Curated annotation (Swiss-Prot), chains A, B:
PANTHER family: AB HYDROLASE-1 DOMAIN-CONTAINING PROTEIN, HYDROLASE, ALPHA/BETA FOLD FAMILY PROTEIN. It comes from Bionectria ochroleuca (Gliocladium roseum). Its EC number is 3.1.1.-. The keyword Lipoprotein does not apply. Changing D223A: Retains about 40% catalytic activity. GO terms for biological process: response to toxic substance. This is Zearalenone hydrolase. The active site is at A102, E126, H242. Changing V158H: Retains about 75% catalytic activity. It catalyses: zearalenone + H2O = hydrolyzed zearalenone + H(+).
Length: 264, 264
């Protein structure tokens, strides 16, 4: 039975969060769009292996929109990490396994490095480390132009699974619609240079498991593969592209549980 | 002005070859389809920077089809490397820069390792190290079935540039048509295990420059990126996929000249 509720933290954020299961804590941090419905099936599937799974909409996104501006403008990994630590503090999650893609991947690595006592192990997927001008240039467009362009880009280029993307439903896509402008203005310029992945050695020997999408063009996260290999960090593939939890929920869920079981 | 001619070597092969330019030798070794007209523009463009450029159809392929069966069945990097050393012997090329993609990539690294006195530097692109059952399954079909399927697969999936691929013309596509079966039967089972990349320390400090296609799915050559990084070998991207010399001739040519100038 899934808890669907709100909890507030003293940095001014009111988080929408979901929680199911009993057992060691596993936390699913969204990608930049900040929408935790993307995890819905995997929440249940990972919980059914004996885990308490918690996820949430990210600050300023979807149903966690009640948040002050610093929390969704000039966003950095280090900022997100501290927001995530504060919602963990509120929910009394002391020791967590954490997953994150994209800005969520940067967040989890910054969590692992900054709060090692708190993080049992971290799985990061497709960690952005490069400025991408086609994304960054949308910031200066009109809100509805941004939503049209980014919605299309997710649907056609990066979903990894067009049908599964569209099957999330109208409600989700209506929340994403409003998030695309806030993401565009707040994330693409400032997340990449915040990447906590330039000190290779600090990554060495850490409980970190890195993935890239199998179908993602080799150029997008070529640099993740080099960096992981130079740091001896485990690196592999998940099917699909930027949203394996949408396109391949069953393999995603099994990967989270199997990687979590390694570190208990 | 380009030389277009044949030369026979004592392993029973009659090679079709082309050559243009004066200067240090640069040799362009085809991919598995063995068809050197794919290089035509780049031959002129690299020569025009002060190089003597040589290429050729590969044994059993295209206009180098007069060759004994061992030269195009159970093909191996080590076999292809000896075949190319013989055509270089015949043509009196003592020192060469070499390029190769796919089976050509395996050939060039085997050349570099096996004949270090002969190879100034090698550029390998998308070196196949894994058995691929969808490719190997085509071996047991009808010849004309194999040509249909592979001609379509190159056109639509892996050219990196559909217009540029088709613009090579009817003559080249008529030669490829006959090569697809010979390749299917001779290459995909035996070329991957022959990959000369399993000894990391032999690669280290060698004049080797490795590339993968930018648009190629991450999974196809993930392993090349890990291997290069573990051996300190330079590794980067070219635009397109499996045939940058077809899809992006100008940037391919400039990459060959620049990388050759580094080592000269
Ligand atoms: C939401 C998702 C966008 C996917 C399409 C993007 O085109 C995928 C490109 C990879 C980088 C995305 C990205 C970059 C960035 O600077 C900050 C981010 O939060 C992301 C990110 O979260 O990626
Ligand atoms: C002809 C070229 C493109 C084949 C499409 C392939 O589907 C592209 C995937 C990479 C594999 C290429 C390949 C594998 C191999 O074991 C031996 C080979 O000679 C090649 C190779 O030459 O591939």
């Amino acid at each position: 039975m899934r808890t669907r509720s709100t909890i507030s933290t003293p940095n001014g954020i009111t988080w929408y969060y979901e929680q199911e299961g009993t057992g060691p804590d596993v936390v699913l941090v969204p990608d930049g769009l900040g929408e935790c419905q993307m995890f819905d099936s995997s929440v249940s599937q990972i919980a059914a292996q004996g885990f308490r799974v918690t996820t949430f909409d990210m600050p300023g996104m979807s149903r966690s929109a009640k948040a002050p501006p610093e929390t969704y403008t000039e966003v950095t990994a280090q900022k997100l990490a501290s927001y995530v630590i504060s919602v963990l503090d509120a929910l009394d999650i002391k020791h967590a396994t954490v997953w994150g893609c994209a800005s969520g991947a940067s967040t989890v690595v910054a969590l692992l490095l900054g709060y090692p006592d708190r993080i049992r192990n971290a799985m990061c997927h497709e960690l952005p480390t490069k400025l991408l001008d086609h994304l960054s240039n949308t910031a200066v467009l009109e809100d509805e132009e941004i939503s049209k362009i980014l919605a299309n880009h997710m649907l056609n280029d990066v979903s990894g699974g067009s049908e599964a993307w569209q099957a999330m439903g109208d409600e989700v896509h209506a929340r994403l619609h409003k998030n695309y402008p806030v993401w565009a203005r707040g994330y693409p310029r400032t997340i990449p240079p915040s990447a906590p992945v330039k000190d290779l050695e600090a990554l060495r020997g850490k409980p970190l498991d890195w993935t890239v999408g199998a179908a993602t063009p080799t150029e997008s996260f070529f640099d993740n593969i080099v960096t992981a290999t130079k740091a001896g960090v485990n690196i592999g593939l998940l099917p699909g592209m930027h949203f394996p939890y949408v396109s391949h929920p069953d393999v995603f869920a099994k990967y989270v549980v199997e990687t979590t079981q390694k570190h208990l």
